[PDB]
């Protein structure tokens, strides 16, 4: 699968948020959020695995810059490519 990185999630974001944002674009096999070891709030980082490259790309192009409540998300693949 293809790994998607989400940044700037708010403190209330959870796995269900990731499923509900990314599932509409295609098959999602895994989601994860990182939480603060001490507060258990979301730290702002999330990860999604999608099976199909073109659906991942559509999710990234659509969701990068998304306003999730009070926060503008950054969504990307790990590194860039010229083709
Ligand atoms: Na904790």
Author numbering: 243 to 325
Task: Please give sentences taken from the publication describing this entry.
HuR/ELAVL1 is an RNA-binding protein involved in differentiation and stress response that acts primarily by stabilizing messenger RNA (mRNA) targets. HuR specifically recognizes adenine and uridine-rich elements (ARE) and uridine-rich sequences in 3′ untranslated regions (3′UTRs) of mRNAs. Hu/ELAV proteins share a common protein architecture with two consecutive RRMs, separated from the third RRM (RRM3) by a less conserved, flexible hinge region of variable length.
We initially selected two 6-mer RNA substrates: a sequence comprising the AUUUA pentamer derived from an ARE in TNF-α 3′UTR, (AU6tnf – UAUUUA), and a poly-U RNA that can be found in class III ARE elements without AUUUA repeats (U6 – UUUUUU). Both RNAs were bound by RRM3, with a Kd of 156 μM and 19 μM, respectively. We observed a substantial increase in RRM solubility after RNA binding and were thus able to use untagged RRM3 incubated with selected RNA ligands for structural studies of the complex. This allowed us to perform a comprehensive and comparative analysis of RRM3 interaction with three distinct RNA ligands: AUUUA motif-containing (AU6tnf), a U-rich motif with sparsely distributed adenosine residues (AU15) and a poly-U motif (U6). While in the structure of RRM3 with U6 and AU15, a uridine is recognized, in the case of AU6tnf RNA, an adenosine is bound in this pocket. In RRM3-AU6tnf and -AU15, the ribose in position 1 forms a (water-mediated) hydrogen bond with the main chain carbonyl of Lys285. On the 3′ end of the RNA, nucleotides in positions 5 and 6 are closer to the RRM3 β2β3 loop in case of the U6 ligand than when AU15 or AU6tnf are bound. In the case of AU6tnf, AU6 and GU6 the binding is predominantly in fast exchange, indicative of a weaker interaction. To summarize, the core of the RNA interactions with RRM3 is formed by three binding pockets with canonical aromatic residues from RNP2 and RNP1 (Phe247, Tyr249, Phe289) that recognize a U–U–U/A RNA sequence motif. The affected area correlates best with the dimeric interface found between chains A and B in the structures of RNA-bound RRM3 suggesting this is the dimerization interface in solution.
